[PDB]
Amino acid sequence: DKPTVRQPDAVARSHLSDFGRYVAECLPKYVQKVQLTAGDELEVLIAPEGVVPVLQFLKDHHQAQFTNLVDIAGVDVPCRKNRFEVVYNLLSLRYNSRIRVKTYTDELTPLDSACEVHKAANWYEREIWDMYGVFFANHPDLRRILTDYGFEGHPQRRDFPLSGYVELRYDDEKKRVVCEPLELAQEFRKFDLSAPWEQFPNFRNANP
Amino acid sequence: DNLFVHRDTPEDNPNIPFEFTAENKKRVEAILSIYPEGHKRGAMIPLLDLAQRQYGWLPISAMHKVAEILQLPNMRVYEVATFYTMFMRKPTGKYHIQVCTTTPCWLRGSDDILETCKKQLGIGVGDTTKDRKFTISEVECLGACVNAPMVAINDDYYEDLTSKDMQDILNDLKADKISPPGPRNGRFASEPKGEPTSLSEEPKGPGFGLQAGL
Amino acid sequence: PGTPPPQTKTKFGPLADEDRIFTNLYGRHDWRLKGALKRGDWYKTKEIVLKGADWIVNEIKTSGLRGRGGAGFPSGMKWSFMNKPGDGRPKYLVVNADEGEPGTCKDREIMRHDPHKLVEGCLIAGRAMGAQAAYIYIRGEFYNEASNMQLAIAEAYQAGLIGKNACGTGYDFDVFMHRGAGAYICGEETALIESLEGKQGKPRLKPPFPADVGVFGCPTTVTNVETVAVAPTICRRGGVWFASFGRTRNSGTKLFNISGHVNRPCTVEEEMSIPLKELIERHCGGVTGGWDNLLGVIPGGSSTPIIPKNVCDDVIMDFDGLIAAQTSLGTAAIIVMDKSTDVIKAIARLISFYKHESCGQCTPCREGIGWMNKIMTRFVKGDAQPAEIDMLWEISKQIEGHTICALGDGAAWPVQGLIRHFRPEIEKRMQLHAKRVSN
Amino acid sequence: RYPSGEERCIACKLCEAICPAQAITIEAEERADGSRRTTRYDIDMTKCIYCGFCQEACPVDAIVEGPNFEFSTETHEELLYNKEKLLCNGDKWESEIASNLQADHLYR
Amino acid sequence: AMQSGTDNVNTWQIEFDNRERWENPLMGWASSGDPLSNMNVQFGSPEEAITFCERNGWRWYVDGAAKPKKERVKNYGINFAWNKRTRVSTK
Amino acid sequence: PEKIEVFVDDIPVQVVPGTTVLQAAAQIGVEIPRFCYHERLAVAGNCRMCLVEVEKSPKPVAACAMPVMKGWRIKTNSDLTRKAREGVMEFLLMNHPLDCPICDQGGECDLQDQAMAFGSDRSRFTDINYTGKRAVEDKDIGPLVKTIMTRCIHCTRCVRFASEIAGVDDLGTTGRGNDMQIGTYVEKLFLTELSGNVIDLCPVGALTNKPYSFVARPWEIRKVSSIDVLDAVGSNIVVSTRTNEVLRILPRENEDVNEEWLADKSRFACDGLKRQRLVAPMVRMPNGELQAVEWEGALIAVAKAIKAAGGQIAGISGQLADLEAQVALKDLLNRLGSEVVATEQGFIAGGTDNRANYLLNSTIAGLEEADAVLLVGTNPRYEAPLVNTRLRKAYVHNELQIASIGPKIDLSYDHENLGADAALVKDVCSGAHAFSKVLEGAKKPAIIIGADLLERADGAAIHATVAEYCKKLKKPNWNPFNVLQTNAAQVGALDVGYKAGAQTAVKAQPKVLFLLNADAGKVTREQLPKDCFVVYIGSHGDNGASIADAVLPGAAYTEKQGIYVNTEGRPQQTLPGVSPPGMAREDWKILRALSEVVGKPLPYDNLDELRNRLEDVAPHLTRLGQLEPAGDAGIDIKLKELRDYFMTDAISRASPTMAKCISAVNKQQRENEAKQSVAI
Amino acid sequence: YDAYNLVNFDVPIGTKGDCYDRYLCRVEEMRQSLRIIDQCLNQMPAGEIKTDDAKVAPPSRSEMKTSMEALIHHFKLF
Amino acid sequence: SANYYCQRDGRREVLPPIDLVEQQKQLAAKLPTPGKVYAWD
Numbered sequence A: 001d002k003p004t005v006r007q008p009d010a011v012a013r014s015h016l017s018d019f020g021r022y023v024a025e026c027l028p029k030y031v032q033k034v035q036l037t038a039g040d041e042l043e044v045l046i047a048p049e050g051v052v053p054v055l056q057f058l059k060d061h062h063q064a065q066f067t068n069l070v071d072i073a074g075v076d077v078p079c080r081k082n083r084f085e086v087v088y089n090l091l092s093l094r095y096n097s098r099i100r101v102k103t104y105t106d107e108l109t110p111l112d113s114a115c116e117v118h119k120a121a122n123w124y125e126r127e128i129w130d131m132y133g134v135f136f137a138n139h140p141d142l143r144r145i146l147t148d149y150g151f152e153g154h155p156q157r158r159d160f161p162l163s164g165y166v167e168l169r170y171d172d173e174k175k176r177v178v179c180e181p182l183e184l185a186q187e188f189r190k191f192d193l194s195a196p197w198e199q200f201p202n203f204r205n206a207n208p
Numbered sequence B: 001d002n003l004f005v006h007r008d009t010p011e012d013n014p015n016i017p018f019e020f021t022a023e024n025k026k027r028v029e030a031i032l033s034i035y036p037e038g039h040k041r042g043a044m045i046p047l048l049d050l051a052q053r054q055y056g057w058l059p060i061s062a063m064h065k066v067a068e069i070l071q072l073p074n075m076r077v078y079e080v081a082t083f084y085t086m087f088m089r090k091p092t093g094k095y096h097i098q099v100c101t102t103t104p105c106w107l108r109g110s111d112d113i114l115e116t117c118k119k120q121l122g123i124g125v126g127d128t129t130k131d132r133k134f135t136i137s138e139v140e141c142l143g144a145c146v147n148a149p150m151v152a153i154n155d156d157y158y159e160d161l162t163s164k165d166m167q168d169i170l171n172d173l174k175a176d177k178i179s180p181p182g183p184r185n186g187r188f189a190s191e192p193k194g195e196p197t198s199l200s201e202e203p204k205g206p207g208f209g210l211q212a213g214l
Numbered sequence C: 001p002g003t004p005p006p007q008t009k010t011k012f013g014p015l016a017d018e019d020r021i022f023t024n025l026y027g028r029h030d031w032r033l034k035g036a037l038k039r040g041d042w043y044k045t046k047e048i049v050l051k052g053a054d055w056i057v058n059e060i061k062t063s064g065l066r067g068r069g070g071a072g073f074p075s076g077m078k079w080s081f082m083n084k085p086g087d088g089r090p091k092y093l094v095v096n097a098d099e100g101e102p103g104t105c106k107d108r109e110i111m112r113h114d115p116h117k118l119v120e121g122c123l124i125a126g127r128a129m130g131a132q133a134a135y136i137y138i139r140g141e142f143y144n145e146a147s148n149m150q151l152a153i154a155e156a157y158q159a160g161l162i163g164k165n166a167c168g169t170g171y172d173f174d175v176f177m178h179r180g181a182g183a184y185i186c187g188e189e190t191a192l193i194e195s196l197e198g199k200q201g202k203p204r205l206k207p208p209f210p211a212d213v214g215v216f217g218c219p220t221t222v223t224n225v226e227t228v229a230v231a232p233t234i235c236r237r238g239g240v241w242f243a244s245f246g247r248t249r250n251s252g253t254k255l256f257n258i259s260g261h262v263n264r265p266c267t268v269e270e271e272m273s274i275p276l277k278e279l280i281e282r283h284c285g286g287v288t289g290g291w292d293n294l295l296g297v298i299p300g301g302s303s304t305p306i307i308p309k310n311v312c313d314d315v316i317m318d319f320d321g322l323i324a325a326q327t328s329l330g331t332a333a334i335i336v337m338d339k340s341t342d343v344i345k346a347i348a349r350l351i352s353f354y355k356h357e358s359c360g361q362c363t364p365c366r367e368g369i370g371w372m373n374k375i376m377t378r379f380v381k382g383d384a385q386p387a388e389i390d391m392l393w394e395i396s397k398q399i400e401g402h403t404i405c406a407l408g409d410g411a412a413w414p415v416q417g418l419i420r421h422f423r424p425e426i427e428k429r430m431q432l433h434a435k436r437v438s439n
Numbered sequence D: 001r002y003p004s005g006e007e008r009c010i011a012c013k014l015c016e017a018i019c020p021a022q023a024i025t026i027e028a029e030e031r032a033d034g035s036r037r038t039t040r041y042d043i044d045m046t047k048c049i050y051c052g053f054c055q056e057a058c059p060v061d062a063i064v065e066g067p068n069f070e071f072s073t074e075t076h077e078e079l080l081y082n083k084e085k086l087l088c089n090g091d092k093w094e095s096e097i098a099s100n101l102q103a104d105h106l107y108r
Numbered sequence E: 001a002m003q004s005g006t007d008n009v010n011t012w013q014i015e016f017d018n019r020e021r022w023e024n025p026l027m028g029w030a031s032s033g034d035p036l037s038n039m040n041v042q043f044g045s046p047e048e049a050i051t052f053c054e055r056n057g058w059r060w061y062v063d064g065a066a067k068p069k070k071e072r073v074k075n076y077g078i079n080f081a082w083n084k085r086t087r088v089s090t091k
Numbered sequence F: 001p002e003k004i005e006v007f008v009d010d011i012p013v014q015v016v017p018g019t020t021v022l023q024a025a026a027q028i029g030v031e032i033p034r035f036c037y038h039e040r041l042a043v044a045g046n047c048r049m050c051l052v053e054v055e056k057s058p059k060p061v062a063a064c065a066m067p068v069m070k071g072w073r074i075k076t077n078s079d080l081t082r083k084a085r086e087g088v089m090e091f092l093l094m095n096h097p098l099d100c101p102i103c104d105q106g107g108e109c110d111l112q113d114q115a116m117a118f119g120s121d122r123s124r125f126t127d128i129n130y131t132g133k134r135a136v137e138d139k140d141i142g143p144l145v146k147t148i149m150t151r152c153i154h155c156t157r158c159v160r161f162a163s164e165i166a167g168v169d170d171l172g173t174t175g176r177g178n179d180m181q182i183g184t185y186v187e188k189l190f191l192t193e194l195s196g197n198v199i200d201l202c203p204v205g206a207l208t209n210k211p212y213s214f215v216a217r218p219w220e221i222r223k224v225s226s227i228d229v230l231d232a233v234g235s236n237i238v239v240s241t242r243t244n245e246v247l248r249i250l251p252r253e254n255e256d257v258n259e260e261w262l263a264d265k266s267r268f269a270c271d272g273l274k275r276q277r278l279v280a281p282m283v284r285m286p287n288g289e290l291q292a293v294e295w296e297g298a299l300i301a302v303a304k305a306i307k308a309a310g311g312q313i314a315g316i317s318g319q320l321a322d323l324e325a326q327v328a329l330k331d332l333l334n335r336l337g338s339e340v341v342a343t344e345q346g347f348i349a350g351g352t353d354n355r356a357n358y359l360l361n362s363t364i365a366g367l368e369e370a371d372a373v374l375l376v377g378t379n380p381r382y383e384a385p386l387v388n389t390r391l392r393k394a395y396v397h398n399e400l401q402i403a404s405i406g407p408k409i410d411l412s413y414d415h416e417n418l419g420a421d422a423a424l425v426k427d428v429c430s431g432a433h434a435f436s437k438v439l440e441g442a443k444k445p446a447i448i449i450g451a452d453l454l455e456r457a458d459g460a461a462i463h464a465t466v467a468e469y470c471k472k473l474k475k476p477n478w479n480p481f482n483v484l485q486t487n488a489a490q491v492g493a494l495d496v497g498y499k500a501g502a503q504t505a506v507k508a509q510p511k512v513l514f515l516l517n518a519d520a521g522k523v524t525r526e527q528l529p530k531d532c533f534v535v536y537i538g539s540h541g542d543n544g545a546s547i548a549d550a551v552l553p554g555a556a557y558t559e560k561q562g563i564y565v566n567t568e569g570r571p572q573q574t575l576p577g578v579s580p581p582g583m584a585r586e587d588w589k590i591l592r593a594l595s596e597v598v599g600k601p602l603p604y605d606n607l608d609e610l611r612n613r614l615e616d617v618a619p620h621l622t623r624l625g626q627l628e629p630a631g632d633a634g635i636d637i638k639l640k641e642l643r644d645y646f647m648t649d650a651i652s653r654a655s656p657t658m659a660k661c662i663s664a665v666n667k668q669q670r671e672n673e674a675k676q677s678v679a680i
Numbered sequence G: 001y002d003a004y005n006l007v008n009f010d011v012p013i014g015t016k017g018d019c020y021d022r023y024l025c026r027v028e029e030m031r032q033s034l035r036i037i038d039q040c041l042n043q044m045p046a047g048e049i050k051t052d053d054a055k056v057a058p059p060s061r062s063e064m065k066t067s068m069e070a071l072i073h074h075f076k077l078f
Numbered sequence H: 001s002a003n004y005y006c007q008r009d010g011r012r013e014v015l016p017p018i019d020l021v022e023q024q025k026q027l028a029a030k031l032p033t034p035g036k037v038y039a040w041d
């Protein structure tokens, strides 16, 4: 027996596999790929034109009441052609389950706002807009929610620096908090924590 | 307590010379002429042992002389003479007593033989005497394992020993007298003792057991 | 083609003195050339080396002669690897001669008492594989044996039996000499290649074979003293007389030496597949204190696992019967151990021998053999937990098969046999030490 | 420090590698007798978050969380701790630190 | 070069040119006004990095293309050879 | 040579016969962990980490020495392979010292990364409380190598690199069993110009960089890719910069230039970047001594001396000068009415017009395929030692016969010394000499001529005749004419059109003599006139700055971005690792600012328009890393010992490590001479 | 998650949804957390605190200062 | 004894996620719910 290895839940595997084949059968227009990851989590990989009609479907069907939307997450992967991906995590209280709906979006290409489906997307879709520049069309008001009012740029992209571009200091000549180009007293020491030997042989050919 | 690195001992420095005797130079030439041309490095091991047939042990000057003969650098001779066990880089006395400690000799009481010789000479293992007369070292298998309690003194096998028998042998060797080799219990060579159970008959001559067509 | 004929004989126990290959084993006759000439040696050698190499290797394949130096690899198929045409490089027969396994002393006695059989077999095998030179690698311990062999080689040179025009046949064969200095790892085939080339120790890896690259970059075959010395008797007495002894696969005649805890130590020449109890009880006395006092036997040297009394009461001593009794034969060495002495100190002495005689190239054999020596020293002392035993078995499973030559295999085998057989002895000694240190 | 008196810190830099706010700056040279011990060990206590990862990542018991917390300063630069300030803190607080490490090492 | 592994080599990356780093006047720390000295961005091919650099308006240059293939043969039998200079002297 | 079918990790691959299992698995991506196999060394089995499980086999096979045959199924990720790797690796980790917090290879140790990747998670060694572990004495190797043999795992990478590539036989393994020790039997200095690579080749860290003793850690290092300018190879290096400090210099992988090796002068010159640096602009006062002067005052002083000279100015390039600095100097002198420029190391007359006169036209990657090479008055192991590594590889792998004309030199391999007479090379061009038949009978022959032999008065004559001999012996896609010039700036200066020879600027009698980073000392005050405003634009200035009147500072090769062209003609670009100390600037920026102060400014403002002007003057000087092959080309050695090799350049002269090396080598020389003379 | 299925407790549910029901739900959460605390002190097994995979968890300081693999894993994971 | 890391290796038993559309296609050569029904009323 192996007590240091997490045992997967089979009743969260079979139900999620049957539901993944079910949602692939019910929506062949938008759903490209459904996958059951390690850790018993189901991912649906939709087209960017199907953000609203998939998240509406999982909201209102009898066999899928994913009525709760917990978080909308943006991941910036600059290697890909469409660099941003947007992940909608949905919780189903009736069937006691979770789903993740992932789509790909570029900064210039807009995305459908899920605010008509779930009202939590009134704010979460602002936050990605504050941090990646993913424009969400047909939004109630798409404003800047977390960064400063005079901030220029989206900070959580991987092409943005860690320490930012500018700093703030009080100027007693102008009697106000002015903006200066960045000069750190001690620079950020970039540690080269790269593994020269591969440790996972199961992920060697997982890219095709 | 052997060392596999060399230090500047006054008795083991390369300052002291070592030249082959002209009687031994034809033996060196014959040993070089046994092995084929281009692969004379194979004459390395019957050369360094040949120094033990002249000097008694192996200094670093003998190593340099072997490397000068074979036209190769000193470190190959260093590593070859450091690997093998008979190339005693330490000083060694006139008689090098080797007592086997390994299991087919240990089963018939080689520990009593070792303790008897250590009481007779009064020295620890791997150490020579003050007058450079006797040298002891615990050693692995030598062969002739039918005669278990043996020792080896100056490449001579002294077999089938008893503690009283080896005490008599060491008393003969301390008074400069030679001692005969072989088993000490009246047995000539390796055989069952007392009865000729095998090879009792006369051996058949030529022409016996020849197959047809040869 | 050449095949070993079936035996169809039930009892392999008794023999006759006329079937002895080594008729001067004990040295009751003249060891020199006149004694060999009056003893039937050096007879019909010219026709044997004139009938061709294919006939000689077919005779060896028909007799079914296996290896006598520690492996069950048959000698005819090994000798057939050098019937291939040469690529401009010379061919070599190399006879290994170290017998540094403890308990192994038969071929030393053949050096001291039957050297012309070894020289004639060297000439016959060199004709059989096309070799024109013979290298025999004596240890530095065997100084009188090397002097006797050099005297016999000088007598054969003076008689014209070897050298240019060997036995009046136009075949050139010079039997050379080499004297190594105190290495048990020399004795392995590729180690002895590297020691003839002038390097130290250090066996080479397998897929460049000795038949491929060999000594001095030239193809060679490494053969035992006993196989070469019984080769003229096989080539003279036919391919079925040698196959009429032993079983079908294991046909031959082997020099068995019995050492340790017997009233008469023993170096007999005996038929293969003899029972062990009959072999001990017939000649050379027996176990001291009777057969009921016998604790265990080692059927080979330090490379083979031990077998206890109840296993060895019904052991047939060929290769295949010993493999069925879960121990290798290897070279022939019967170490007899009675109940008066502990097995643990003797197995620890064998592992200390393997620690002293490993060449240190391979890392499992350099490190884990010293580990097993430390654990066996604690097992002598008794200061170990019970768990270490099976963990020590794991160390054997991390050394056996993971090394370059079979010294790691030959050192992992007897601890495996000790853990398999005498485990309650270890538990009793360790419990005695625990009760000694607790109170 | 060791009981003999030599400083414990062998400049092995796991503490700076594990410091999440990156307060520790270590610069090391070989000393005259051949030791590895530091030439610069600075901890920015205005950057240090008092998380204790450095004492867990210390192979010897060199860096340690002392019992002192009444070390409020009048001036911002006085909280930039040098190697000499840390060595003086180790000299001053050695008894309580050694008692805590004696009473706490078997938990860690 | 002190390691034989190569799992951190196969990923292309873009980086920026080094700028002025100076000693701090107060303490011995190194200070830099360059915000982009610590930003290396990973890519799976050079052409995607070219597309990224032209899309973000950066002035780019390529340090060097990868080595296509080094054909090498490793034979154990060349260590022990006859009339060849590739024979080893040690083991 | 038909390929065979091998199923590795249940994946098909077609491999040519004779390849190892490790190569056949690295063809698809999976790598086997290794300790005693390097790609550039001989295969061996001193570790057993390469034990992989092939199907229908009783024992695991050593993947770095297994010639794979047709239809083997190799299972790298099997259970038996992982059990074998864990067992062999905990055997490797049994006697190894717990020195990781005091070991300089910690964080880049192969043993740590393979313990995380393939080893077990705990120890089963319960014998450390009693009978202990193995500890061995430290061996005495000189000031470049710190030796602690307790950490050694006995893989014989160092012994194989000494025996094959380095050519010295002083390293070996002594003893048997656990007591094998990988070191010299006696206290000897392992002296070699390629000794530093052994620190790269030790997989664990028994052998350690002694200048880089206890300085920093691998994760702390910022790695910047650049080139080395100390030797002629133009070897690609990676520089360890952390917090505005040069820590060490390591080899960078390129099969064409350096092949993962580095010379000792290339590697241990990082200590010379701290000593004798130029941090302030210095102007010679009328008192007689130089004083530190601000930048504007120094620039207007040099401008006033230029206006007082009136167009009689000249400039000499340096030993370590940048290509862009030489272009800026040439543009400043040509815009000020001076048509004379110079270089420290001379050359033949008329060789500037064709490139193949001054190139190592056979590739350094191609010199390992040579069959018979002739050295005309050069010692390649002290001038450019990676060329000697290529010649050593071609010596051991191909049946190569090499003859050298000149004095008695050691090449670390055997060679026939024809003599020190000059006219004997004419015998090589006569066909009557015995080596001429070997040269015409070779498949890929070559002739290498040193630059010091081309600087002598015979010179172009010896450059002409063997070129005719090259026109007698040529093969397709092979240019056998070769020249090896020690200065890294020489090939770039002759690319941009520098009149080679310092005597061309000496005989012009300059009122203001510009100097780049030139410390060879070929020009002095006695050859110069009574008044001569010597402006030295350099980084160190051990020599050539004491005679200067306006010592301007400069950045070293690790502190600025510029191009260097090596002896084969391949342009490469260095990168700025650290900032220049004090107020030192880049040399082309200094020359552009001086041109703006004088009144005739250069048109380029930044580096991009300077590269555009480089395209304007030579189209092959901007294709960095790409070599354009040229067409046909139409006795004493100053470097013959190691102590002559150590202090050739200015950075190597300012370094204390090279002085320590010469002190240790000379101490060993007097020790050996005293022990030899005490026996007489 | 993390032995919440081995403890027994009640869940406070409001009706009106105002601030008073949420306040009563929070104080009732404080009441039920006392009996979860009581069950956690009542049953507590004697065992290890960390997982024994030493490549994901730091080893003990005695194993770090005594054995080799634990020192290598301590070095790497820190 | 009997402790091997590969028998208890937690990190190396993680696989890439299974394509659920292709899993049916390569395995074929009461409505489905994502979980059990919980009554929250």
Ligand SMILES: Cc1cc2nc3c(=O)[nH]c(=O)nc-3n(C[C@H](O)[C@H](O)[C@H](O)COP(=O)(O)O)c2cc1C
Residues within 6 Å of the ligand: C066, C067, C068, C069, C070, C071, C073, C074, C075, C078, C096, C097, C098, C099, C100, C101, C184, C185, C186, C187, C188, C189, C222, C223, C224, C225, C227, C405, C406, C407
């Ligand atoms: C460590 C080791 C030591 C060996 N020592 C000897 C020895 O002393 N004598 C011997 O004949 N064979 C010895 N062998 C066996 C040889 O490798 C080889 O198999 C044999 O000598 C020739 O085989 P054959 O009898 O089939 O001709 C040894 C093998 C190993 C692994």
Ligand code: SF4
Residues within 6 Å of the ligand: C185, C202, C203, C357, C358, C359, C360, C361, C362, C363, C365, C366, C403, C404, C405, C406, C407, C408
């Ligand atoms: S098994 Fe041991 S004795 Fe044999 S080669 Fe390997 S290292 Fe040498």
Ligand code: SF4
Residues within 6 Å of the ligand: D008, D009, D010, D011, D012, D013, D014, D015, D016, D026, D054, D057, D058, D059, D060, D062, D063
């Ligand atoms: S404080 Fe501790 S962890 Fe940090 S460098 Fe010093 S000894 Fe290492």
Ligand code: SF4
Residues within 6 Å of the ligand: D015, D018, D019, D020, D021, D022, D023, D024, D043, D047, D048, D049, D050, D051, D052, D053, D054, D055
């Ligand atoms: S306690 Fe302070 S110095 Fe130590 S690791 Fe945490 S933040 Fe860094």
Ligand code: SF4
Residues within 6 Å of the ligand: F096, F097, F098, F099, F100, F103, F104, F105, F106, F107, F109, F110, F111, F112, F151, F204, F205, F206
């Ligand atoms: S050589 Fe490697 S494993 Fe050994 S002490 Fe140094 S870093 Fe640790």
Ligand code: SF4
Residues within 6 Å of the ligand: F151, F152, F153, F154, F155, F156, F157, F158, F159, F182, F201, F202, F203, F204, F205, F206, F207
């Ligand atoms: S010193 Fe280093 S390179 Fe040499 S055998 Fe030991 S581990 Fe290998």
Ligand code: FES
Residues within 6 Å of the ligand: B100, B101, B102, B103, B104, B105, B140, B141, B142, B143, B144, B145, C101, C102, C103, C104
């Ligand atoms: S075991 Fe003692 S000589 Fe063989």
Ligand code: FES
Residues within 6 Å of the ligand: F033, F034, F035, F036, F037, F044, F045, F046, F047, F048, F049, F050, F051, F062, F063, F064, F065
């Ligand atoms: S590197 Fe392959 S077995 Fe050592």
